[PDB]
Structures are given as structure tokens and as C-alpha cells.
Amino acid sequence: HMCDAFVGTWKLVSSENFDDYMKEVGVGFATRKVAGMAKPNMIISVNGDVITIKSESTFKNTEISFILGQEFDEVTADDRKVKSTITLDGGVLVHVQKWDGKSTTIKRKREDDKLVVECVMKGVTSTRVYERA
Ligand SMILES: O=C(O)c1cccc(COc2ccccc2-c2ccccc2)c1
């Protein structure tokens, strides 16, 4: 029942500070503009020990599959090649991405009927709120 509170189909309803987060990450101007417009559908599923997160949007379609605690290689929507580890900490999915001696952490939590995504890169935080599709 791992991650049951997260499983389903979710749609972005609000974003704050995302352009600033993307700039801290190193995303270039054109990508930031187009990516910042996107309203993704996020699909989270669980099959045994394997979690799959898909993000579908007019910007990019991305999919990751992983086992908690077990590092994987991820190519991000903005084309970084990162090493990612996702863990469940106190009911929060914590996703750390490492590349070029940089790190960013994305946390996904359930709050009321929403799924709240917090993206942090050095001092800059963005909050993205999803509701059930
Ligand atoms: O809202 C999310 O599910 C979420 C989760 C985890 C991480 C991030 C951050 O991802 C991005 C990072 C850099 C540049 C662009 C993106 C990006 C922009 C639009 C759709 C998908 C990725 C968004």
C-alpha cells in the first residue's frame, strides 16, 4: 500500500516561483517560458516495489520508474542528465537530483485533497499544487 495516497491522476492547478526555480537550476530563457506555461497531468502508479511517475504536457512527456532508496539515472524535462534517489520520509516523497556537482530536491506531499510539490534549489523554493484529474 506503499504510496497509496499518491497513486492516481493529478492535474496542475497553480505554480509559484517556478521561473526563479528553473533559473537557479540553469534552465535557459526559451525553455523556461515554454515550460512555465505547461499544465501537466501527473500519473503516479505502484506495481509491487516499483513506483512510476509520468508527467504529460504540451511541453514534454516524461516517465520515471524507481524503487525507493535505489539510485537511478534520469533525463529531466529540461535535458539534464541527473542521478536521482527517491525516498519516503515521514509520508513525504523526497526526490534528490545530483548533476555537475549541483543538487536539487523535490518533495511531494499530500495536503487535504491536493498533492503539493515543493522544488528547492539553493535557497529558491517553488510550490506547485496538483488536484485530482
Ligand atoms: O510539477 C512537477 O511535477 C515537477 C516535479 C519535479 C520537478 C519539477 C521540475 O521540472 C522541471 C525542471 C526544470 C525545467 C522544467 C521542468 C518541468 C516543467 C514542466 C513540466 C515538467 C517538468 C516539476
- Give the overall silhouette: globular
Cα radius of gyration in angstroms: 14 Å
Distinct ligands: 3-{[([1,1'-biphenyl]-2-yl)oxy]methyl}benzoic acid
Number of domains: 1
CATH topology: the name is: Lipocalin
The description of the largest β-sheet is: 10 strands, antiparallel
Which architecture per CATH?
Beta Barrel
Protein name: Fatty acid-binding protein, adipocyte
Motif (Nuclear localization signal): 23-33
Subcellular location: Cytoplasm; Nucleus
Binding site for a fatty acid: 128-130
Provide structural commentary.
With 133 residues, the protein is mainly beta. The protein has one domain: Calycin beta-barrel core domain (Lipocalin), CATH 2.40.128.20. The protein has helices at 18-25, 29-37, and strands at 8-16, 41-47, 50-56, 61-66, 72-75, 81-89, 92-99, 102-111, 114-121, 124-132. The protein has a ten-stranded antiparallel beta sheet with strand order 4-3-2-1-10-9-8-7-6-5. The longest helix is centred in the first third of the chain and has 9 residues, at 29-37. 3-{[([1,1'-biphenyl]-2-yl)oxy]methyl}benzoic acid (WNR) is lined by residues 22, 25, 27, 35, 38, 40, 42, 55, 57, 59-60, 76-78, 106, 117, 119, 128. The site of 3-{[([1,1'-biphenyl]-2-yl)oxy]methyl}benzoic acid has 18 residues, from α1 and β9. The modification Phosphoserine is found at residue 14. The modification N-acetylcysteine is found at residue 3.
